[PDB]
Design a protein around this ligand. Structure first.
Ligand SMILES: Nc1ncnc2c1ncn2[C@@H]1O[C@H](COP(=O)(O)OP(=O)(O)OP(=O)(O)O)[C@@H](O)[C@H]1O
Ligand SMILES: Nc1ncnc2c1ncn2[C@@H]1O[C@H](COP(=O)(O)OP(=O)(O)OP(=O)(O)O)[C@@H](O)[C@H]1O
Ligand SMILES: Nc1ncnc2c1ncn2[C@@H]1O[C@H](COP(=O)(O)OP(=O)(O)O)[C@@H](O)[C@H]1O
Ligand SMILES: Nc1ncnc2c1ncn2[C@@H]1O[C@H](COP(=O)(O)OP(=O)(O)O)[C@@H](O)[C@H]1O
Ligand SMILES: [Mg+2]
Ligand SMILES: [Mg+2]
Lengths: 532, 100, 352, 299
């Protein structure tokens, strides 16, 4: 028994020779080894001592992955692994340059936020490959237990260390890359609040010494690149937002989606399906048809599923013996995916009087919006607003109605339509909840168009909060709104003057082909919407 | 005794054919044309790749639609052995971890 | 060899040789140590009481760190570490003067409240260094449990002792600088508010004999400088506000922000980015432009990120070899941070 | 060992002198006649009995009025051993009753543990913040408090570890609570309600002059000659800065003035510091209450 235990002690001691064990950790090993010496193999506590000491020896101490510090090589890896993402690539390149000047490895906390399917999770793997790091991914969205972060107590039966502690062994280095998913989706819980634990992780002062619940020793969590992914920044907790560096990843236009699908989505799905380029062919027109009709999202997550379905059916066809090679032409696309899911890009092809197209932004992505007005009845008029409008959205309608009445007095004094009539205002798709003052200027145009009986200029979309006197206030999600407007095939877009920075931060090709108008007062909007 | 009882290098032939696999599924269960079509595609891609473990298939739906019985039918389709990893309680060292 | 009982007992006894053990403390360990002699090593109860004895010996009974009582030395450290915030510095200076008149170490409970990013947490480390005191930091934000504050009985498995007990063990002294963060947003427990246990922690009369569930012996929690951090004093519990001293840390005007950025934010960011003063230079007007048009806030937390971003982009140019030296000017500031965020100050220039 | 360590029939030599008890109570606290009268009646009844006795008393009132501090003085006056129990935000029922001896490392309740260290079956148990006890779903220690605070059933108190009834009578139970509505009705009935009201501005001046300022001076180490606080300055501080029922706010303001004066003497700014109503704002800060009414003449 002792001889077998002696061999266990010797092999454990050999493992820790290479690790640079801290001063306060080696004594923990010595006392555990001493307890292992006086314990019998059949003792229940022997397994706990054997397992816990193994975990302490398994966790690296002072072992760092060999980082890559070549700007040219790292840039080439990033370009070949992903399309676009210039802002993300610029930050990574700057990260390498700073480490080169420092002369040693260092860590940072980064946040990527945008619509799902953009490539937030995939770029993390490419960054780790470019940085010669170890990639680890875990999610905290809808997570309420804090024990998962730091494990459980040693004395508890069937207890294991936390994911970060589990990360150290599998990565076998003290310089890994950690990815956190659905940070904006965390919520308050009765059993415990993991937000406090997340605050310590992302705090450069606090993360230098991290305390777990199994190992019960501080671990230097600094010099670790923390990357977190979210959909929106508003729902992220305020203390967590400060510790995180915000980097925005936007959606892709139809011309951008085809480039991604042609170079990345199709070859990846084809490779995992066991097919080759010669046997399975996907032309550009079918890929274009899939994007226009079979997909509506801003990302390419749904497009990937459609592509994988096509290759799955093609692989089955060749195996069954229908044909040695399958070509996915637009004529036989229905045999693979079926009838198109979306047949109309916009609900109103030609807007009747009282109908104005608007722009909306969500965590899902950009979207188009329509505002319809009608005469509810043939001393004082009234306005009724329908749809799942929020408190802020309903208030903006009241502001728009008041300004619309005042605007008509100074423009058409003889017109008393807005004061002596009952008008019903409805935003279609009433099932989906709506909120925000984004459509303030859209409501004014709809009320003015109905009162004057003049349809608004075709292919025109507008957004922006409107004040009581007519001032146009900036609105968020300009990038998402512009992408949705381009997908909807609009030609003229009206934006607040204070949002000029956000609009011009978009790519050159996205801006090209769009007649953008920047306004500060609604008086300029009136001329654009009603040229005559 | 347990060491010698574990088979090593002894494995029955798998994925005998595709037409017989389809016929086995049609006889085992009625309907599920969409579900059966997916299974045939899963078998076809596995044959092309040559690897048994391409990806894990998860069936979700209303209770009582015979999701469990499909795996038994699938095993007979490509000549495998069926086993059920049914779990009702999540315990670390009760089912998978083992003892000693 | 064959002295496992002796070695454990002798090692524990040696720990109390250099500590001023109170009468009520070493009386308890005597009955615990005698219980070890009559206990079997392989027994499960043996593990529980050995940990209890180890925890008892880990407490630094009567151990006081050599504090600094030099007014001139402490004032110089405080001035060189932070800008402004005279109210916090004045309280610390009076604390040292009282200690000099007292002739012995003393503890106080202080609370700093103000906007985020006004150096409330940063000066806590500076004060501890100036006072030559050990520093411990932990937060009570979203806290809805009482067990970590007090502890658990030895009967329960995995009985985590109180958090304060952990502070005394690592600091190895009875006069640390424990900072309580986010006391304003302490979780209101549906089953029970944990702030009730915090009252005993922050009650100067009750700090003399603080009882925790695990150790089961009172610990002299006096002579400890308790610092509390908060954003709004309204959400702090009323009984907790009575025992805590309110010190206000106001925000910074544009003039004050420029002084902080020029003297503290920029030099620290340069060291963090590994850039020399000559390699990257940020002019005063550039910093003024960043404060005016890029950071509309009371604190300087947002300004620190913008300053780091400019240096981070400058560091890339140096490494890439595009420019041997980088100088930031208002004309080319957009090349580093982009278009200004806040281009206007008021919606109406002339009010109708 | 636990069973034998219990002081069965061991009583401390209580002090039964009314004059001595009257003097001791007045050394540390001002006013509190209702609390002091109850203690005086407690001693008078014990003298008539010829033997020690126990009672259950609950002091309620505004926070910071002296409910917790007077308990220590009462034990010193009564020559009883002092033990303090905290139940604020407490949900562990076993801490009061105990645990079954079958469990490994089982221990008795806190009441039984207190008797062992006290070595006397006549202690003075003080329970703080019984009003805000933890009524969680994990446990309800307030329900277990009924057996602990039952005047008739205290003679036979059963704890899980010992499994033997212990005579918990002859014990003066003092309970502190800021409010009484949150206390359970069965628990409220068993305890005797004693109200400790707040102090008026006139009463606060007496407290500050005789108890707060001398204690602050000893705490700060500043002599009366070095820094002098007069009645008029103290009256101004109470009038415009300390309007709450308790004296905790007044204690901080008095400490602040002495703290500022201590720095001046230490720094060498002044050999002696004299405080006047003109200079009060410099030492303590901006006045809080200045306007007593917003209408001089009501329209
Ligand atoms: N398509 C089918 N063809 C033939 N028999 C079927 C079919 N679907 C279900 N059955 C029969 O109904 C029984 C009930 O199905 P089963 O118990 O497998 O459901 P399940 O999907 O495992 O349910 P649960 O969600 O409750 O776990 C099957 O065992 C089988 O006998
Ligand atoms: N009459 C008095 N004379 C002298 N000191 C007093 C008097 N009343 C209160 N104090 C002092 O005020 C402080 C607060 O007293 P204490 O802590 O007992 O209040 P409390 O009402 O029991 O508090 P809580 O309900 O918050 O626990 C103590 O320092 C005490 O000495
Ligand atoms: N620019 C791009 N270049 C290459 N692949 C991309 C690009 N954008 C998206 N993808 C692909 O689309 C998928 C997006 O899924 P993912 O980003 O993991 O979803 P989520 O953003 O919700 O985490 C990835 O698998 C990635 O391969
Ligand atoms: N007057 C100042 N002098 C130097 N640095 C300052 C000053 N004010 C703020 N800072 C810097 O700004 C940061 C503010 O963070 P801090 O306010 O301590 O966080 P919290 O709000 O959580 O307490 C600190 O890191 C500090 O370095
Ligand atoms: Mg089933
Ligand atoms: Mg009290």
């Amino acid at each position: 028994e002792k001889d077998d235990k002696d061999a266990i002690e010797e092999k454990f001691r050999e493992r820790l020779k290479e690790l640079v064990v801290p001063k306060h950790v080696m004594d923990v090993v010595d006392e555990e080894l001493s307890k292992l010496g006086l314990l019998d193999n059949h003792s229940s506590e022997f397994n706990v001592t054997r397992n816990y000491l193994d975990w302490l020896t398994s966790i690296p101490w002072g072992k760092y992955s060999n980082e890559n510090l070549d700007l040219a090589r790292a840039q080439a890896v990033l370009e070949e692994d992903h399309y676009g993402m210039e802002d993300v690539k610029k930050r990574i390149l700057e990260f390498i340059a700073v480490s080169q000047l420092r002369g040693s490895t260092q860590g940072k906390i980064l946040c990527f936020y945008g619509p799902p399917g953009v490539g937030k999770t995939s770029i993390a793997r490419s960054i780790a490959r470019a940085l010669n790091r170890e990639y680890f991914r875990f999610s905290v969205g809808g997570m309420t237990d804090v024990a998962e972060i730091k494990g459980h107590r040693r004395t508890y039966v069937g207890a294991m260390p936390g994911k970060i502690i589990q990360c150290l062994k599998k990565t076998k280095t003290e310089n890994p890359l950690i990815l956190i998913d659905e940070v904006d989706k965390i919520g308050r819980g009765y059993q415990g609040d993991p937000s406090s634990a997340l605050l310590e992780l992302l705090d450069p002062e606090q993360n230098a010494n991290f305390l777990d619940h199994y190992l019960d020793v501080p671990v230097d969590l600094s010099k670790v690149l923390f990357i977190c992914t979210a959909n929106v920044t508003d729902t992220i907790p305020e203390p967590l937002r400060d510790r995180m560096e915000m980097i925005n990843v936007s959606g892709y236009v139809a011309q951008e989606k085809l480039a991604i699908a042609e170079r990345y989505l199709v070859p990846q799905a084809r490779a995992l399906c066991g097919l080759d380029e010669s046997k399975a062919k996907l032309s550009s027109d079918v890929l274009t048809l899939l994007i226009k009709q079979y997909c509506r999202e801003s990302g390419v997550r749904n497009l990937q599923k459609q592509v994988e379905k096509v290759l799955r059916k093609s692989a089955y066809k060749i195996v069954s013996g229908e044909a040695e090679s399958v070509e996915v032409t637009p004529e036989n696309l229905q045999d693979f995916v079926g009838k198109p899911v979306f047949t109309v890009e916009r609900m109103y092809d030609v807007t009747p009087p009282g109908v104005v197209m608007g722009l909306a932004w969500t965590a899902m992505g950009g979207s188009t919006l329509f505002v319809e007005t009608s005469l509810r009845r043939p001393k004082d008029g009234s306005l009724e607003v329908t749809g799942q409008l929020g408190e802020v959205m309903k208030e903006s309608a009241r502001i728009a109605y008041t300004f619309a009445r005042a605007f008509l007095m100074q423009h058409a004094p003889a017109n008393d339509y807005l004061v002596t009539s009952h008008i019903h205002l409805h935003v279609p798709e009433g099932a989906t909840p709506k909120d925000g003052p984004s459509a303030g200027c859209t409501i004014v145009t709809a009320l003015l168009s109905l009162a004057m009986g003049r349809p608004v200029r075709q292919n025109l979309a507008m957004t922006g909060e409107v004040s009581l006197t007519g001032k146009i206030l900036p609105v968020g999600g300009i990038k998402e709104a512009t992408i949705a407007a381009k997908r909807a095939g609009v030609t003229c877009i009206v934006l607040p003057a204070e949002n000029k920075k956000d609009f011009y931060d978009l790519a050159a090709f996205i801006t090209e082909g769009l007649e953008v108008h920047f306004v500060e007062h609604y008086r300029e909007i009136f001329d654009i919407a009603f040229p005559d």
